[PDB]
Design a binder for these strands. Structure first.
Ligand SMILES: [Ca+2]
Ligand SMILES: [Ca+2]
Ligand code: NA
Lengths: 236, 245
DNA sequence: GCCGGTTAACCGGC
DNA sequence: GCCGGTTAACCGGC
């Protein structure tokens, strides 16, 4: 992580001291590496004005996996112009991107209202993560990027920060990730609760996640009969 | 439908309306309020009015009995603690996962309206209409309690496009869920098991009774669930086994 | 034309 | 404590 080293600094400037308000901090203390996902894409294409067409521009990523996680559609990529730049997207994989010397940190910020009942938010699609692990293995890309999370807790007429949390997805035990199939097949968890005791290699994590994903896929399929078929059979 | 008789006018008044550069639902509410003041309510407003007129009824248990309908209780009520803690000083407010956007009621009959805004400037994408599971439970409760002439679930689509520093409405569509062919409803399991369709495209030729609609939907639901189960193996299991064996 | 996955984030049952 | 369903629409591959 590029943020981990300066976590204390961020935590001390947030607690009490809005959404993406952390981006400001990062874009000032790491202005050299901080980007919104859409800003990184514009930056990458502006730097190579000689490369046109989506097929060519996609090659700019130099990584089938990163291409998969960060790129926009073919049309959007081909239609990309210097006078027609990319804008933020609700569907974007990451909130903030930190890249240095060909290594990437996909950072997601999660805001939690410590006043309401605890309800783990959608973290990332378990399916997208499976395709990611598959691409990591197929292309042997095990030392290219990390997916990390920064949690910001908040709470009379103003909403101030009370604490923060930071965790790395790849440091968590794969089989411990809760996949909520109904909730758009999303992994869900509060950052503060995310396990960080995995000790294996990045390759072992990917294989372990795939076994977990496949197993949960089987379990969900069977459970659908139990909850969506059995109780309604008597009406038909 | 209660808004049906005055639909042509809603359509005319809505086309042209603008919002500061989703909120069109509030404008929909506005008109209905001025044209059907006594039948129009936000879902939370309806709940507040019901409890306000029965101040002596306290506790979630007693308050739940005020709905005098298992199906309506299921579709409209807030949780037990929320119902327990309600008070004139602690009223209900909008809730993200409430079933309906607007309720129109008259003489014990209910119309649950869900406004569906649509950005007409982009590639058509059928939005989440309602949970296929919530709908199945609803049909099951209708059958168990014989409530087949109590309520309707309808949709009002508001099409809009960017026009300067605001969004403007270019057209609208209205359709009724119970007039559609149940077996043709698209259930997108990944998308929170939601039924998906464009109001403008929903068929309206069902020829059976409400009871028949419920049974037919239940048949469709169960069949699609069975298919999804097996389908999950082909899409989420088979393609990744090569990485764990 | 056809088809379905993704983000953001949120209560409430027992 | 443990567990999971719901609303809002929305996009891009072949
Ligand atoms: Ca996020
Ligand atoms: Ca709506
Ligand atoms: Na809905």
């Amino acid at each position: 992580s590029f943020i981990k080293p300066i976590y204390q600094d961020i935590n001390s400037i947030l607690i009490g001291q809005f959404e993406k308000l952390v981006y400001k901090f990062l874009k000032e203390n790491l202005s050299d590496l901080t980007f919104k996902q859409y800003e990184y894409l514009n930056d990458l294409f502006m730097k190579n004005p000689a490369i046109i067409g989506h097929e060519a521009r996609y090659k700019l990523f130099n990584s089938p996996t990163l291409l998969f996680l960060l790129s926009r559609g073919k049309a959007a990529t081909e239609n990309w112009s210097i006078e027609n730049l990319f804008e933020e997207k609700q569907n974007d994989t990451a909130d903030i991107l930190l890249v240095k010397d060909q290594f990437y940190e996909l950072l997601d910020v999660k805001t939690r209202n410590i006043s309401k009942s605890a309800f783990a938010p959608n973290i990332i699609s378990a399916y997208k993560l499976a395709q990611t692990c598959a691409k990591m293995i197929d292309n042997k890309e095990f030392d290219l990027f990390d997916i990390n999370y920064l949690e910001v807790d908040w709470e009379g007429e103003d909403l101030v920060c009370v604490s923060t949390s930071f965790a790395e997805l790849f440091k968590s035990e794969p089989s411990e990730l809760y996949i909520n199939w109904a909730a758009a097949m999303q992994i869900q968890f509060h950052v503060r609760d995310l396990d960080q005791g995995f000790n294996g290699t990045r390759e072992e994590w990917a294989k372990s996640y795939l076994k977990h994903f496949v197993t949960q896929a089987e379990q969900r399929a069977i459970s659908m009969i139990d909850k969506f078929v059995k109780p309604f059979k008597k009406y038909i």
